[PDB]
Design an enzyme around this catalytic site. Sequence first.
Site, PDB file in Angstrom:
ATOM      1  CG  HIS A  41      11.774   6.642  81.927  1.00  0.00           C
ATOM      2  ND1 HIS A  41      10.676   7.083  82.631  1.00  0.00           N
ATOM      3  CD2 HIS A  41      12.653   6.180  82.853  1.00  0.00           C
ATOM      4  CE1 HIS A  41      10.883   6.914  83.926  1.00  0.00           C
ATOM      5  NE2 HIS A  41      12.080   6.374  84.090  1.00  0.00           N
ATOM      6  N   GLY A 143       6.199   6.963  90.975  1.00  0.00           N
ATOM      7  CA  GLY A 143       6.344   8.403  91.033  1.00  0.00           C
ATOM      8  C   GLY A 143       7.669   8.874  91.598  1.00  0.00           C
ATOM      9  CB  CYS A 145      11.120   8.100  87.885  1.00  0.00           C
ATOM     10  SG  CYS A 145      10.731   6.340  87.747  1.00  0.00           S
TER      11      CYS A 145
END
Lengths: 305, 306
Positions: A41, A143, A145
Amino acid sequence: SGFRKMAFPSGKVEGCMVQVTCGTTTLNGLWLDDVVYCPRHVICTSEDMLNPNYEDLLIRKSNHNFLVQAGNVQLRVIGHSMQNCVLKLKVDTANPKTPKYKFVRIQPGQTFSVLACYNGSPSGVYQCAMRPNFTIKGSFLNGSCGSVGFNIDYDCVSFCYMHHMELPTGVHAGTDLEGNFYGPFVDRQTAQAAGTDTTITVNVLAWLYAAVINGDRWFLNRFTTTLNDFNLVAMKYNYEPLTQDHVDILGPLSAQTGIAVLDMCASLKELLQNGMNGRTILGSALLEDEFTPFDVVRQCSGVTF
Amino acid sequence: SGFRKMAFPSGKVEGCMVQVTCGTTTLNGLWLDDVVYCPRHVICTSEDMLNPNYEDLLIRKSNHNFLVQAGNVQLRVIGHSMQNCVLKLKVDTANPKTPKYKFVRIQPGQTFSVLACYNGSPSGVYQCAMRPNFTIKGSFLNGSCGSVGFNIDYDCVSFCYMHHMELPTGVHAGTDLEGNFYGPFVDRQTAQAAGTDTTITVNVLAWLYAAVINGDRWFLNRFTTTLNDFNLVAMKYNYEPLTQDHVDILGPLSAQTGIAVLDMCASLKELLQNGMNGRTILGSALLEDEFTPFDVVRQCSGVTFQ
Ligand SMILES: *[C@H](O)[C@H](CC(C)C)NC(=O)[C@H](CC(C)C)NC(=O)[C@H](CC(C)C)NC(=O)OCc1ccccc1
Ligand SMILES: [Cl-]
Ligand code: NA
Ligand code: NA
């Protein structure tokens, strides 16, 4: 003596974290050999995230659309592909800090260490379990991920988790390193919720053994039970069923302490039925369920890596 | 969201851990530049535990009586000296993995990460606090001596603890990296006991602010308190006095949540009175006191979940 929630040493994983940027989105990547792994993503705008066609959004993208930063060195991307919900970026340089490693998918109830990262930089390490409902109770901000979870065995890092999202209850969902989600979740902005969780029975028993090993015995009693009778109690209190395999795994701790598993189940049965009567176990007023039997033996043995 | 006992990434410290052996005794040392730091009681033998004279024990040692092993490499000791309760071994090789570092002595209530090690090899990492009674509630087995505690705020490792011993209640005692013990303890096996321990009030307040930041307010109430009335009540539950320094430290958390510090004091007073009535706070059924104000700001979002 003493008993603490303990994470694996994180140095081998720290040397693998990089920053990946696509467009306005920055998150973390895992750099092993000559490939960087991160959530797919990263290629999505906020508009895309509502109903993303990842096939179409990716073929649109090219190598030059991805900026990979290891410390203050730019890694040149020379290839890109997808595997399930993970994006794979081939870079021109193999990570010289690549440890011995495997990709492993864990089962609910198993624990692992999370190395929380922001902008490619390790920030913190903590221990957590894969819940029965396939979430983790993490600690993550925007942030994060691409942060990963792992276990170590001697010199081999077993990567088992990559962080993708936060659910409305504040718990977290992600994939294995092959991009396969844990739990019935998808990487799109749509209505998604954690299902009702249960307590990990075998791990509570493991922690009760840890307590006995550390001198906490008030909950022991003269009674034993059967699996069938205990599992009716477990179901009543939203505990996971206890299987014969769980009893076998707890065998060591049973022998060491002299409390047969079904003996300890009688203690847990009573704790569930009566509460703790104002007392604590290993410094907790709750029945802890994020120590596996292995975790208990390893911490009470002093295993090193 | 979420909230965990979060340690610092340990890699920078892993690369400094070595094994030190003297006689039949082996423990961990910290290799920074060309110096290895370890507990001086590595030079004790079975008879030396009650009333060791470390000056006399050490003068009998040569450099080659100390075996230092970094992974698979034997380091060569070329000098030694004792500073308080630490032995400093000069070696012929500077540690190429030495991080930016400093040595800091911390105050009770401060937290740090511990890298538990055995035979120079890291075992695990966890968070600890220096208790008001100058002990820590660690997890340490035989051979963990020389394991260190540290913080890594802003890419610099601040070493603040070296492990030396275990007291009878299962808690642990040690020194700063200049070899000065925390608390009244000494590196002798004569009877010693931790004082009655108390709860770190300023940290509990920090953790209640964390819970509000993360979106939970059920424990607040309509009351306030004077600082002195709060301390008069809290000390009846064996809580440490709250000082104006503590009140000032909590300012940023008070500002982000809009809850005045002394109003959060009132909430705590009521929690001590009532318990939680079957509820939890950040997943705990007890009041947690090993997160500092700085730790909460480090880990929580700067934006409250209102
Ligand atoms: C070093 O690895 C080891 C680590 C412990 C966690 C085991 N430290 C020691 O062995 C240490 C050496 C002495 C010279 C400082 N001794 C102790 O920690 C000792 C307990 C051991 C034997 C398990 N503690 C101790 O002596 O405390 C003082 C004392 C004496 C008598 C009664 C109460 C307390
Ligand atoms: Cl019976
Ligand atoms: Na029993
Ligand atoms: Na000092």
